[PDB]
């Protein structure tokens, strides 16, 4: 290689050196060799062509092998060589670029001190495209995209020609479909997400251009292309509603509406938003979840998000087009698939249409026409649409009251067919909650349902069946207080007649619908004890579409502004008798196993339901107690042993964690005390699960670098594993509550650089909670969390910075109390983040937000720490950040700045207000700046009355 290095910088030397390199496949020197060798051959211009094609092939194969131990010096060197040698060698050089950018930390660390080199690369690719091989063109758009996904990529500078380039390319209505269009739409999404609240004019023009081009490349791979176009529609959802309120665009948008309808209506039954992609359960799902009026997207469904995305976006664009009745016409359509699609689009749309009395009445008449459609699909969806409309204030008008009776009627009989036993139940429940029919017309039918329970019972025992049965139990303990054991005993009989877990039709068809939460809540009601607690939002993971929507979710108010738009013992023994056979049959089915997803999931839901109500069914103590516990836990053990010895491709542990999570508590001391007092059998379950986890680990990089990495499947599984470990240790120690168990910390500080970032939400959750941590605990945790941030592969990535800021925030009051051993570490890290990380153009938007929160919290504890360490004051850093920062950070701070005036005596508020206003945006050519200024002044005013005078004065001033 040394003599070969001299050989490169005589064709037997060059071609031979490249052959020896290919055989091969500090570095800086060989890289110089290759560069100047290609240059010597370039000036020394078919053999010439072959040697030119073959030298940077060796180059690119070297940049796929030292691209790990490369640094910014070698980065700039390679980049300037690529842009200097070329004024033939397109594909080789572009390949070197592609393989240099494939490593994300590379294209992020080039977004350092200036953006000179980043702009060099982006302009390289823009010029290359605007010249436009064809596959090389795809690689050009790919490396352009790979540059644009860097949340500290300075885009605003080279943001004039870039979108026009990308969406000028796409206007070509040929080159049937491939990576080209997927990458076109990916760069569009990212650049638009940047420039969504800066350069409003550019954006309105762009959307006026890409609402047409979207109604063409939606020709009815294609999975990912429909996904990118649905993300695009999620973005543009606001410019469309603004433009329609401001005349080609109406024609174009209507044509696009009809392309969406024509595409969705020929999707007959497999992938058409099946009725198993929604749940009617009354769990505490998080607020940012996707939901519509009655149902909501089934948790942990990364496979049914595209259909919900399409229907959600279509409902929004339709209620935003009929604003400036396509749906009722399509409802009276002829082709049955069109009527089915118009039956699906009723709840999504009524979530935001605010219909009038005539429209509600008419649509309801037609739906009562469609309810009896002899068809599981159509009758079901029709009843769901009806029960979506039945939850207004418009529906409670007498002009259609008998109509409700009709629908009630058309459901009271439609309860015994397992095809439509779910939707029908929903309907009943809806009418029994909104009170559209008085409490004497509907008493005989309820008596029939609850006393008979074999005809006009909810034939299937799913989420909505249990909801309705609970509402009926309460109705009948409210009207006929005498004969309440009748209700409770009929209820228990129905529950244990319908709940057959160890059967193929149940376990495979509607096993996913029914959850242990609903079962045990109904049973605890009919005994008479109490609900399950479930006092916090469920934890779940999502897929790309919903995550991307969760990115553009905090900033939608600023875009709606910038755009200007003893008997109990009888019943318990009854239930125990009726229940034990279920466990016996389950244990026989389990002994046979020493297998699919559905049978195994049903068995684990059954063992959860068993472990939940053991503390119920032991006060019986009629010798069917010991046997019950032993049998339940024998099922649990057999299940775990099927789970372990299995391929990690089914991912059964995904199933068990996803099912068992909603019962894991919050990790504070009082809740972990009430888990040792009320539900201990759940704790024994969690112990067995922890053992299986430990052992499966004994047997054997980053999916996304956003702030949302902790909502992807990988992160959810890691956080759940560690909460399970935590609960197990707490159970065993029995008094080591709260005090973070040193084994848990040693499992925290014994992970990889890819996982410490994944479990950061778990670290936040434990540490923020009041919990004695060992000295070495906080010290070691902080040592490792800091070490992640100084590796040149994480020095720029968003997630590492956010995580180290959060961990410093967790122990805010150790270093700012005394001088410990940790105070030096936090000093070093504060200094590196403030003085060094921030002006280097390395902190991203979410990193700057997390640092703003760190500072705003620091002022409430020390308020001068940054001086006693030798830096400018914290407030100085905060406002310096406010002046220069991507509008997302400006919005966050302006929203949480009116809390900065809470740490100061009332005498000095106009002084602080002068100081702040010194650091706002103000320039007449920039209208976004003035918009932000008026925004923050309105916020201060609407919170602090002291600053109302100056807020109004400066609002009228500009």
Coordinates of C-alpha atoms in Angstrom, one line a residue, residues 262-802:
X262 CA -62.2 6.5 -6.1
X263 CA -59.0 5.0 -4.6
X264 CA -60.5 4.0 -1.3
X265 CA -63.8 2.6 -2.6
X266 CA -62.1 -0.2 -4.6
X267 CA -60.4 -1.8 -1.6
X268 CA -63.0 -4.3 -0.9
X269 CA -62.5 -6.1 2.4
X270 CA -58.9 -7.1 3.3
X271 CA -57.4 -3.7 3.8
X272 CA -60.3 -1.2 4.2
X273 CA -60.1 -0.3 7.8
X274 CA -61.4 -3.5 9.2
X275 CA -63.5 -3.5 12.4
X276 CA -60.6 -5.0 14.3
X277 CA -58.5 -1.8 13.9
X278 CA -60.7 0.0 16.4
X279 CA -61.5 -0.5 20.1
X280 CA -64.5 0.7 22.1
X281 CA -62.8 0.1 25.5
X282 CA -63.0 2.7 28.2
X283 CA -59.3 2.7 29.1
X284 CA -57.3 5.8 29.8
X285 CA -55.6 6.1 26.4
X286 CA -53.3 9.1 26.0
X287 CA -54.8 12.4 24.8
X288 CA -52.6 12.7 21.6
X289 CA -54.0 9.4 20.4
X290 CA -56.0 9.1 17.2
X291 CA -59.7 8.8 18.0
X292 CA -63.1 9.8 16.5
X293 CA -66.1 10.4 18.6
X294 CA -66.9 6.8 19.7
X295 CA -64.0 4.4 18.8
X296 CA -60.3 4.9 18.6
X297 CA -57.3 3.3 16.9
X298 CA -56.5 0.0 18.6
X299 CA -53.3 0.4 20.7
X300 CA -50.1 -1.3 19.4
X301 CA -51.4 -1.5 15.8
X302 CA -48.5 -0.5 13.6
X303 CA -50.4 -2.2 10.7
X304 CA -53.7 -0.3 10.5
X305 CA -52.5 3.3 10.5
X306 CA -52.6 4.0 6.8
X307 CA -56.3 3.4 6.5
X308 CA -57.0 5.6 9.5
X309 CA -54.7 8.2 8.1
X310 CA -56.5 8.3 4.7
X311 CA -60.0 8.5 6.3
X312 CA -58.9 11.1 8.8
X313 CA -57.3 13.4 6.2
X314 CA -60.2 12.9 3.9
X315 CA -62.7 13.9 6.6
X316 CA -60.7 17.0 7.4
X317 CA -60.4 18.0 3.7
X318 CA -64.0 17.3 3.1
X319 CA -65.3 19.4 6.0
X320 CA -62.8 22.0 4.8
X321 CA -64.1 21.9 1.2
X322 CA -67.9 21.8 1.8
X323 CA -67.1 24.9 3.9
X324 CA -66.0 26.8 0.7
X325 CA -72.6 18.1 0.5
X326 CA -70.5 15.7 -1.5
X327 CA -71.0 13.1 1.2
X328 CA -74.7 12.9 1.1
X329 CA -74.7 12.5 -2.7
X330 CA -72.1 9.7 -2.4
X331 CA -74.3 8.3 0.3
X332 CA -77.2 8.0 -2.3
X333 CA -74.7 6.4 -4.7
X334 CA -75.3 3.2 -6.6
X335 CA -72.2 1.1 -6.4
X336 CA -72.2 -0.6 -3.0
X337 CA -68.6 0.1 -2.3
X338 CA -69.2 3.8 -2.6
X339 CA -72.0 3.5 0.0
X340 CA -69.8 1.5 2.3
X341 CA -67.0 4.2 2.1
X342 CA -69.6 6.9 2.8
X343 CA -70.7 4.8 5.8
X344 CA -67.2 4.6 7.1
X345 CA -66.6 8.4 6.7
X346 CA -69.5 9.4 8.9
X347 CA -67.8 9.4 12.4
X348 CA -64.6 10.9 11.3
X349 CA -66.5 13.7 9.6
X350 CA -69.1 14.3 12.3
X351 CA -66.1 14.8 14.7
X352 CA -65.8 18.2 13.0
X353 CA -68.7 19.3 10.9
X354 CA -71.2 20.7 13.4
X355 CA -74.2 19.7 11.3
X356 CA -77.6 21.4 11.3
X357 CA -80.9 19.8 12.4
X358 CA -82.0 19.0 8.9
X359 CA -78.7 17.3 8.0
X360 CA -78.6 15.2 11.2
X361 CA -82.3 14.2 10.7
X362 CA -81.9 13.3 7.0
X363 CA -78.6 11.4 7.3
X364 CA -80.2 9.5 10.3
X365 CA -83.2 8.6 8.2
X366 CA -81.0 7.2 5.5
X367 CA -78.9 5.3 8.0
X368 CA -82.0 3.7 9.6
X369 CA -82.6 2.7 5.9
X370 CA -79.2 1.1 5.8
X371 CA -79.0 -0.5 9.3
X372 CA -81.0 -3.6 8.1
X373 CA -78.6 -4.4 5.2
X374 CA -78.5 -8.1 5.8
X375 CA -74.7 -7.6 5.9
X376 CA -72.2 -7.8 8.7
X377 CA -70.0 -5.1 7.1
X378 CA -72.7 -2.7 6.1
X379 CA -75.1 -3.2 9.1
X380 CA -72.2 -2.9 11.5
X381 CA -70.7 0.2 10.0
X382 CA -74.1 1.7 9.7
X383 CA -74.9 1.3 13.4
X384 CA -71.5 2.8 14.2
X385 CA -72.3 5.9 12.0
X386 CA -75.6 6.2 13.8
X387 CA -74.0 6.0 17.2
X388 CA -71.6 8.6 16.1
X389 CA -74.4 11.0 15.2
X390 CA -76.2 10.2 18.4
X391 CA -73.7 12.1 20.6
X392 CA -74.5 15.7 19.7
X393 CA -76.7 18.4 21.2
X394 CA -78.5 18.4 17.9
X395 CA -79.7 14.8 18.3
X396 CA -81.7 15.7 21.4
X397 CA -84.6 17.2 19.3
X398 CA -88.0 15.7 19.3
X399 CA -88.5 15.9 15.5
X400 CA -86.7 12.6 15.2
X401 CA -87.2 11.0 18.7
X402 CA -89.2 8.1 17.4
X403 CA -86.4 7.6 14.9
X404 CA -84.2 6.8 17.8
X405 CA -86.8 4.2 19.0
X406 CA -86.5 2.7 15.5
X407 CA -82.7 2.4 15.7
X408 CA -83.0 1.2 19.3
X409 CA -85.4 -1.4 17.9
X410 CA -83.2 -2.3 15.0
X411 CA -80.5 -3.0 17.5
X412 CA -82.4 -4.7 20.3
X413 CA -83.1 -7.6 18.0
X414 CA -79.6 -7.4 16.4
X415 CA -77.8 -8.6 19.5
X416 CA -77.7 -12.4 19.1
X417 CA -75.9 -12.6 15.8
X418 CA -72.1 -12.8 16.3
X419 CA -71.6 -11.0 13.0
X420 CA -73.1 -7.7 14.2
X421 CA -73.2 -8.2 18.0
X422 CA -70.5 -5.5 18.5
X423 CA -71.7 -2.5 16.6
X424 CA -75.3 -3.1 17.7
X425 CA -74.2 -3.1 21.3
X426 CA -72.4 0.2 20.7
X427 CA -75.6 1.7 19.4
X428 CA -77.6 0.6 22.5
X429 CA -74.9 1.8 24.8
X430 CA -74.7 5.2 23.0
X431 CA -78.5 5.7 23.3
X432 CA -78.3 4.6 26.9
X433 CA -75.7 7.3 27.6
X434 CA -76.9 10.4 25.7
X435 CA -80.5 9.9 27.0
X436 CA -82.4 10.2 23.7
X437 CA -85.2 7.8 24.8
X438 CA -86.8 8.2 28.2
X439 CA -86.2 5.8 31.1
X440 CA -89.6 4.0 30.8
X441 CA -89.8 3.1 27.2
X442 CA -86.5 1.4 27.4
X443 CA -87.0 -0.6 30.7
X444 CA -88.7 -3.7 29.4
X445 CA -86.1 -4.3 26.8
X446 CA -83.4 -3.9 29.4
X447 CA -85.2 -6.3 31.7
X448 CA -85.3 -8.8 28.8
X449 CA -81.6 -8.4 28.1
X450 CA -80.4 -8.7 31.7
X451 CA -82.9 -11.4 32.9
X452 CA -82.8 -13.6 29.9
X453 CA -79.2 -13.2 28.7
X454 CA -79.5 -16.1 26.3
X455 CA -81.8 -14.3 23.8
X456 CA -81.1 -10.5 23.4
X457 CA -77.8 -10.9 25.2
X458 CA -74.6 -9.5 23.8
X459 CA -73.8 -12.8 22.1
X460 CA -70.1 -12.3 21.8
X461 CA -68.4 -10.9 25.0
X462 CA -66.1 -8.2 23.5
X463 CA -65.2 -4.7 24.7
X464 CA -68.5 -3.2 23.8
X465 CA -70.5 -6.1 25.2
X466 CA -68.9 -5.5 28.6
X467 CA -69.5 -1.8 28.4
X468 CA -73.1 -2.3 27.7
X469 CA -73.5 -4.9 30.4
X470 CA -72.0 -2.6 33.0
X471 CA -74.4 0.2 32.0
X472 CA -77.3 -2.2 32.2
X473 CA -76.2 -3.5 35.6
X474 CA -76.2 0.1 36.9
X475 CA -79.5 0.9 35.2
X476 CA -81.2 -2.1 36.9
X477 CA -79.7 -1.4 40.3
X478 CA -81.0 2.1 39.9
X479 CA -84.6 1.3 38.9
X480 CA -85.3 -1.9 40.7
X481 CA -83.2 -1.8 43.9
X482 CA -85.0 -4.9 45.1
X483 CA -83.8 -7.9 43.2
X484 CA -80.2 -6.8 42.9
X485 CA -78.8 -10.3 43.4
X486 CA -80.9 -11.1 40.4
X487 CA -79.0 -8.6 38.3
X488 CA -75.6 -9.6 39.7
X489 CA -76.1 -13.3 39.3
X490 CA -77.5 -13.1 35.8
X491 CA -74.5 -10.9 35.0
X492 CA -72.0 -13.4 36.3
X493 CA -73.7 -16.2 34.5
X494 CA -73.6 -14.4 31.2
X495 CA -70.0 -13.4 31.7
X496 CA -68.8 -16.9 32.3
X497 CA -71.0 -18.5 29.6
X498 CA -69.8 -16.1 26.9
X499 CA -66.1 -15.9 27.9
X500 CA -64.6 -19.0 26.4
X501 CA -60.9 -18.3 26.0
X502 CA -59.7 -21.8 25.1
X503 CA -61.6 -22.2 21.9
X504 CA -60.5 -21.5 18.3
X505 CA -63.3 -19.2 17.2
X506 CA -63.0 -17.0 20.3
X507 CA -59.2 -17.0 20.7
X508 CA -58.8 -16.3 17.0
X509 CA -61.7 -14.0 16.0
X510 CA -62.6 -11.7 18.9
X511 CA -59.8 -12.4 21.4
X512 CA -58.1 -9.2 20.4
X513 CA -61.2 -7.1 21.1
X514 CA -61.7 -8.2 24.7
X515 CA -59.2 -7.1 27.4
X516 CA -58.7 -8.1 31.0
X517 CA -59.4 -4.5 32.2
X518 CA -63.0 -4.7 31.0
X519 CA -63.6 -8.2 32.3
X520 CA -62.3 -7.5 35.8
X521 CA -64.1 -4.1 35.9
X522 CA -67.5 -5.7 35.1
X523 CA -66.9 -8.5 37.6
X524 CA -65.7 -6.2 40.4
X525 CA -68.9 -4.2 39.7
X526 CA -71.2 -7.1 40.0
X527 CA -69.5 -8.4 43.2
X528 CA -69.6 -4.8 44.5
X529 CA -66.0 -4.0 45.2
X530 CA -64.4 -1.2 43.1
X531 CA -63.0 -0.4 39.6
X532 CA -59.4 -1.1 38.8
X533 CA -57.4 2.0 39.3
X534 CA -55.6 2.7 35.9
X535 CA -54.8 6.2 37.0
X536 CA -52.5 7.4 34.2
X537 CA -52.4 7.4 30.3
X538 CA -51.5 4.1 28.8
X539 CA -48.0 3.7 27.3
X540 CA -48.0 2.7 23.6
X541 CA -45.9 2.9 20.5
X542 CA -46.9 4.2 17.1
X543 CA -45.8 3.9 13.5
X544 CA -44.3 6.5 11.2
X545 CA -47.5 8.2 10.0
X546 CA -48.9 8.9 13.5
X547 CA -45.5 9.8 14.8
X548 CA -45.0 12.3 12.0
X549 CA -48.3 13.8 12.9
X550 CA -47.2 14.0 16.5
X551 CA -44.3 16.2 15.3
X552 CA -46.6 18.8 13.7
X553 CA -49.0 18.7 16.7
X554 CA -47.5 21.2 19.2
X555 CA -47.1 23.9 16.5
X556 CA -50.6 23.9 15.0
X557 CA -51.8 26.8 17.1
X558 CA -49.1 29.0 15.8
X559 CA -50.0 28.0 12.3
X560 CA -53.7 28.7 12.9
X561 CA -52.5 32.1 14.0
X562 CA -49.8 32.9 11.4
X563 CA -52.4 31.9 8.7
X564 CA -55.3 33.8 10.4
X565 CA -57.8 31.1 10.6
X566 CA -72.7 -11.2 52.7
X567 CA -74.8 -11.3 49.5
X568 CA -71.6 -10.1 47.8
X569 CA -70.1 -13.3 49.2
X570 CA -72.9 -15.3 47.5
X571 CA -72.1 -13.7 44.2
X572 CA -68.4 -14.2 44.6
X573 CA -68.7 -17.9 45.4
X574 CA -71.1 -18.1 42.4
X575 CA -68.4 -16.5 40.2
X576 CA -65.7 -18.8 41.6
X577 CA -67.7 -21.9 40.9
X578 CA -68.5 -20.7 37.4
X579 CA -64.9 -19.7 36.7
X580 CA -62.8 -22.6 37.9
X581 CA -63.7 -24.8 34.9
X582 CA -62.2 -22.2 32.6
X583 CA -58.9 -22.5 34.4
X584 CA -59.0 -26.3 34.5
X585 CA -59.6 -26.4 30.7
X586 CA -56.9 -23.9 30.1
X587 CA -54.4 -25.9 32.1
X588 CA -55.2 -29.0 30.1
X589 CA -54.7 -27.1 26.9
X590 CA -51.4 -25.9 28.3
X591 CA -50.2 -29.3 29.3
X592 CA -50.8 -30.4 25.8
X593 CA -48.2 -27.9 24.6
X594 CA -45.2 -29.6 26.3
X595 CA -49.2 -22.3 19.5
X596 CA -50.1 -19.5 17.1
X597 CA -50.3 -15.8 17.9
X598 CA -54.0 -15.7 18.7
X599 CA -54.2 -18.9 20.9
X600 CA -51.2 -17.8 22.9
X601 CA -52.4 -14.3 23.3
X602 CA -55.8 -15.5 24.5
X603 CA -54.1 -17.7 27.1
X604 CA -52.1 -14.8 28.4
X605 CA -55.1 -12.5 28.6
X606 CA -56.8 -15.3 30.5
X607 CA -53.9 -15.6 33.0
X608 CA -54.0 -11.8 33.4
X609 CA -57.7 -11.9 34.1
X610 CA -56.9 -14.7 36.6
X611 CA -54.1 -12.9 38.4
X612 CA -56.2 -9.7 38.7
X613 CA -59.2 -11.1 40.6
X614 CA -57.4 -13.5 42.9
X615 CA -57.7 -11.2 45.9
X616 CA -61.4 -11.2 45.1
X617 CA -61.9 -15.0 45.1
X618 CA -59.9 -16.0 48.2
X619 CA -62.1 -14.5 50.9
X620 CA -64.4 -17.3 49.8
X621 CA -61.8 -19.7 51.2
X622 CA -64.0 -22.8 50.3
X623 CA -61.0 -25.0 49.4
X624 CA -61.5 -23.9 45.8
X625 CA -59.0 -21.2 46.7
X626 CA -55.7 -23.0 47.0
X627 CA -56.4 -25.1 43.8
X628 CA -57.4 -21.9 41.9
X629 CA -54.1 -20.0 42.7
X630 CA -52.0 -23.1 41.9
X631 CA -53.8 -23.7 38.7
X632 CA -53.6 -20.1 37.5
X633 CA -49.9 -19.9 38.1
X634 CA -49.3 -23.3 36.5
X635 CA -50.9 -21.9 33.4
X636 CA -48.6 -18.9 33.7
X637 CA -45.5 -21.0 33.9
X638 CA -46.5 -23.2 31.0
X639 CA -47.2 -20.1 29.0
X640 CA -43.8 -18.6 29.8
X641 CA -42.1 -21.8 28.8
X642 CA -43.8 -21.8 25.5
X643 CA -42.8 -18.1 25.1
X644 CA -39.1 -18.5 25.8
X645 CA -38.2 -21.5 23.6
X646 CA -39.4 -20.0 20.3
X647 CA -38.0 -18.0 17.4
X648 CA -37.4 -14.3 18.0
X649 CA -39.3 -13.7 14.8
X650 CA -42.8 -14.3 15.9
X651 CA -41.8 -11.9 18.7
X652 CA -44.1 -13.4 21.4
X653 CA -42.4 -11.2 24.0
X654 CA -43.7 -8.3 22.0
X655 CA -47.2 -9.7 22.6
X656 CA -46.8 -10.4 26.3
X657 CA -45.3 -7.0 27.0
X658 CA -47.9 -5.1 24.9
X659 CA -50.7 -7.0 26.7
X660 CA -49.2 -6.7 30.3
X661 CA -48.2 -3.1 30.1
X662 CA -51.5 -1.4 30.9
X663 CA -51.3 -2.9 34.4
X664 CA -47.8 -1.8 35.3
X665 CA -48.2 1.1 37.8
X666 CA -46.5 4.4 38.1
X667 CA -43.2 3.9 39.8
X668 CA -43.7 6.2 42.9
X669 CA -43.5 4.9 46.5
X670 CA -47.3 5.2 47.3
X671 CA -48.5 3.3 44.3
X672 CA -45.7 0.7 44.8
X673 CA -47.1 0.4 48.4
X674 CA -50.6 -0.2 47.1
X675 CA -49.4 -2.8 44.7
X676 CA -48.1 -4.7 47.8
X677 CA -51.5 -4.4 49.6
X678 CA -54.2 -4.9 46.9
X679 CA -53.0 -7.0 44.0
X680 CA -50.1 -9.2 45.0
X681 CA -50.8 -12.0 42.6
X682 CA -50.2 -9.4 39.8
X683 CA -46.8 -9.0 41.5
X684 CA -46.1 -12.7 41.3
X685 CA -47.0 -12.6 37.7
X686 CA -44.6 -9.7 37.1
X687 CA -41.9 -11.8 38.9
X688 CA -42.3 -14.8 36.7
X689 CA -42.2 -12.4 33.7
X690 CA -39.0 -10.8 34.9
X691 CA -37.4 -14.2 35.3
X692 CA -38.3 -15.1 31.7
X693 CA -36.9 -11.8 30.5
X694 CA -33.6 -12.2 32.4
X695 CA -33.1 -15.7 31.1
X696 CA -34.0 -14.9 27.4
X697 CA -31.3 -12.2 27.7
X698 CA -29.0 -14.8 29.2
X699 CA -29.4 -16.9 26.0
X700 CA -28.3 -14.4 23.4
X701 CA -28.6 0.9 15.8
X702 CA -31.1 3.7 16.4
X703 CA -34.3 3.5 14.4
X704 CA -35.0 7.3 14.5
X705 CA -33.0 10.2 15.9
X706 CA -35.9 12.5 16.7
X707 CA -37.3 13.4 20.1
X708 CA -39.9 10.6 19.4
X709 CA -37.4 7.7 19.4
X710 CA -39.1 6.8 22.7
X711 CA -42.4 6.1 20.9
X712 CA -41.1 3.4 18.6
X713 CA -41.4 -0.3 19.3
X714 CA -37.8 -0.8 20.3
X715 CA -38.0 1.8 23.0
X716 CA -41.4 0.6 24.3
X717 CA -40.0 -2.9 24.7
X718 CA -36.9 -1.7 26.5
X719 CA -38.8 0.6 28.9
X720 CA -41.3 -2.2 29.7
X721 CA -38.5 -4.7 30.3
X722 CA -37.0 -2.4 32.8
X723 CA -40.2 -1.4 34.6
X724 CA -40.9 -5.2 35.0
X725 CA -37.4 -5.7 36.5
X726 CA -38.0 -2.8 38.8
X727 CA -41.3 -4.1 40.1
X728 CA -39.8 -7.6 40.7
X729 CA -36.9 -6.2 42.8
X730 CA -39.4 -4.1 44.8
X731 CA -41.5 -7.2 45.5
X732 CA -38.5 -9.2 46.7
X733 CA -36.9 -6.5 48.9
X734 CA -40.2 -5.4 50.6
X735 CA -39.0 -2.1 52.0
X736 CA -36.7 -1.0 49.3
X737 CA -39.5 1.1 47.9
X738 CA -38.6 4.3 46.1
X739 CA -34.9 4.0 47.0
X740 CA -33.6 3.1 43.5
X741 CA -32.3 -0.4 43.8
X742 CA -28.6 -0.6 43.0
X743 CA -29.3 -3.6 40.7
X744 CA -31.6 -1.4 38.6
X745 CA -29.0 1.3 38.3
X746 CA -26.3 -1.2 37.4
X747 CA -28.6 -2.5 34.7
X748 CA -29.0 1.1 33.5
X749 CA -25.2 1.8 33.4
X750 CA -24.6 -1.5 31.7
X751 CA -26.2 -0.9 28.3
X752 CA -25.2 0.2 24.8
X753 CA -25.1 3.6 23.2
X754 CA -28.2 2.7 21.3
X755 CA -30.2 1.7 24.3
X756 CA -29.3 4.3 27.0
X757 CA -31.1 6.7 24.6
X758 CA -34.1 4.3 24.2
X759 CA -34.9 4.0 27.9
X760 CA -34.5 7.7 28.6
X761 CA -38.2 8.1 29.3
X762 CA -37.9 5.4 32.0
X763 CA -34.9 7.2 33.5
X764 CA -36.9 10.4 33.6
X765 CA -39.8 8.6 35.2
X766 CA -37.9 7.1 38.0
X767 CA -35.5 9.9 38.9
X768 CA -37.9 12.8 38.7
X769 CA -40.1 11.0 41.2
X770 CA -38.8 11.5 44.8
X771 CA -36.5 8.6 45.3
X772 CA -33.3 8.2 47.3
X773 CA -30.5 7.5 44.8
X774 CA -27.1 6.3 46.0
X775 CA -24.2 8.7 45.7
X776 CA -22.5 6.5 43.2
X777 CA -25.9 6.1 41.6
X778 CA -26.3 9.7 40.4
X779 CA -22.6 10.0 39.8
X780 CA -22.3 6.9 37.6
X781 CA -25.5 7.6 35.7
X782 CA -24.4 11.1 34.9
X783 CA -20.9 10.0 34.0
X784 CA -22.2 7.6 31.4
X785 CA -24.9 10.0 30.1
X786 CA -22.3 12.6 29.6
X787 CA -19.8 10.2 28.0
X788 CA -22.5 9.5 25.3
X789 CA -22.5 13.2 24.3
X790 CA -18.7 13.5 23.5
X791 CA -18.3 10.8 20.9
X792 CA -18.5 12.7 17.6
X793 CA -21.3 10.3 16.6
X794 CA -23.6 11.7 19.2
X795 CA -22.2 15.1 19.7
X796 CA -24.7 16.4 17.2
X797 CA -27.6 14.1 17.3
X798 CA -30.8 15.4 18.7
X799 CA -31.6 12.5 21.1
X800 CA -28.2 12.5 23.0
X801 CA -28.4 16.2 23.8
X802 CA -32.0 15.9 24.9

